[PDB]
Design a protein around this ligand. Structure first.
Ligand SMILES: Nc1ncnc2c1ncn2[C@@H]1O[C@H](COP(=O)(O)OP(=O)(O)NP(=O)(O)O)[C@@H](O)[C@H]1O
Length: 279
């Protein structure tokens, strides 16, 4: 039943939605009850979707405190994630090697829960650096896994950024989806592969137009792999990383970004890999 909220308490926490808003028009910061939160405004009663998706709770998934339906709109209150999104940090203090490995581990931990032990399993479909939030200890918190996906919303929209949805599509989406709409948990594995590549290189998923998911193959192929990998590594790490474990992590990302979905590993395997190379 989560926690039923009175719309009043939401107005006061958000200063009556007084450009206390985070970037997203529907995303506001609510300061109240000591622990801060984030309020997302959604059109129409989406209560039915919550009663299904509310099954998904995990330490590394953005937690839903509750919801409120007021005058034809649904206001959802999530745990506030200070330090914003991984994209902000990778494309802007800099995340150390330890932190980058921790974040990859939390995401693999959440993807492992979603694909196997969520009752029933659920495919994310929208795993991106911008959706992976961080908390005060820079731990991962997956977010836009439902109802915020482009065509998952029952109430369609025309306040839509086409060029932006398409940029993320080419950089994160697996080929079997772009070509046939084939939706399997392997598409999350492909996306998760690109995230790791972002964590290792800090590069844009689509650079200035080469995709970050095709460069890892050239970096690990042929000869002089050590030198090509050093150059691939994020400069901001400044040698403060074990090149051995970086190559290993880059290897598990290449398998994740393979074109054949059945060749890709299950996230459960990636979760076991990241846990053994962790501190
Ligand atoms: N629970 C939360 N805690 C803190 N910040 C949040 C939370 N949910 C969303 N945000 C912020 O709200 C913005 C994104 O809102 P969102 O509804 O996810 O749309 P979005 O634009 O698709 N996400 P993004 O990929 O980062 O641009 C980002 O600046 C996030 O940091």
């Amino acid at each position: 039943s989560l926690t039923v909220y009175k719309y009043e308490d939401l107005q006061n926490a958000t200063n009556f939605f007084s450009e206390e808003n985070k970037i997203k028009g529907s995303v506001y910061r609510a300061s109240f009850k000591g622990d801060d939160a984030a309020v997302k405004i959604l059109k129409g009663d989406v209560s039915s979707e919550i009663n299904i998706l509310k099954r998904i709770n995990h330490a590394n998934i953005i937690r839903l405190s509750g919801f409120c339906v007021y005058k034809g709109n649904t206001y959802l209150v999530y745990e506030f994630a200070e330090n914003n999104s991984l994209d902000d940090w990778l494309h802007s203090m800099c995340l150390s090697w330890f932190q980058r490995v921790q974040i990859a581990h939390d995401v693999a931990d959440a993807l492992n829960y979603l694909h196997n032990y969520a009752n029933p399993p659920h495919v994310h479909k929208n795993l991106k650096s911008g959706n992976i939030l961080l908390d005060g200890k820079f731990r991962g918190k997956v977010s836009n896994f439902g109802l915020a996906r482009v065509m998952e919303n029952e109430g369609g929209d025309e306040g839509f950024q086409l060029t932006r949805h398409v940029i993320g599509t080419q950089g994160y989406m697996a080929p079997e989806y772009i070509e046939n709409g084939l939706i399997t948990p392997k598409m999350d594995v492909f996306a998760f592969g690109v995230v790791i590549l972002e964590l290792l290189s800090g590069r844009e998923v689509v650079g200035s137009d080469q995709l970050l998911a095709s460069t890892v193959n050239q970096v690990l192929e042929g000869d002089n792999v050590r030198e090509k990998l050093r150059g691939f590594m994020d400069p901001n790490l400044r040698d403060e990383y074990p090149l051995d474990l970086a190559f290993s992590m880059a290897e598990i990302a290449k398998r994740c970004v393979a074109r054949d979905l059945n060749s890709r590993p299950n996230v459960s395997e990636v979760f076991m890999i990241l846990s053994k190379i962790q501190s």
